[PDB]
C-alpha cells in the first residue's frame, strides 16, 4: 500500500509482478502465488 496516496493500485500490482512475485515463488513450499487488485500493464490506445 501507499499510505500517502503516492502510488495507485495499478503501479503497485505491476511492481509486485516485476519485483515481488518471482522472488517469492523461489521460496520453498510455495505452490501458487496470486495477485488480486487492478490489472496488468497494457498499451491503451483510446481512439476518438
Amino acid at each position: 500500500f501507499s499510505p500517502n496516496g503516492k502510488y495507485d493500485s495499478l503501479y503497485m500490482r505491476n511492481y509486485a509482478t516485476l519485483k515481488v512475485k518471482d522472488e517469492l515463488a523461489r521460496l520453498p513450499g510455495v505452490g501458487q502465488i496470486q495477485i488480486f487488485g487492478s490489472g496488468e500493464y497494457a498499451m491503451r490506445v483510446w481512439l476518438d
Binding site: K21, A25, V30, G31
Partner: protein
C-alpha cells in the same frame, strides 16, 4: 519453445522468465536451467 527472429536476450527475458516462474511451483525440483540461442529456440531443463 520458439521465438522466431527474437534476440536471445529478449527470448530469455520474455519467454524463459515466466516459464521459470510457473515451473517453480513444482515439487522435488533440484535446479532449473534455460538456454536461448540465436536460432530462436529456448530450451529449459528442469532437473529433479
Amino acid at each position: 519453445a520458439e521465438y522466431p527472429g527474437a534476440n536471445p536476450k529478449v527470448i530469455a527475458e520474455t519467454v524463459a522468465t515466466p516459464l521459470e516462474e510457473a515451473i517453480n511451483g513444482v515439487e522435488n525440483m533440484m535446479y532449473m536451467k534455460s538456454v536461448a540461442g540465436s536460432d530462436g529456440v529456448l530450451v529449459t531443463t528442469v532437473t529433479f
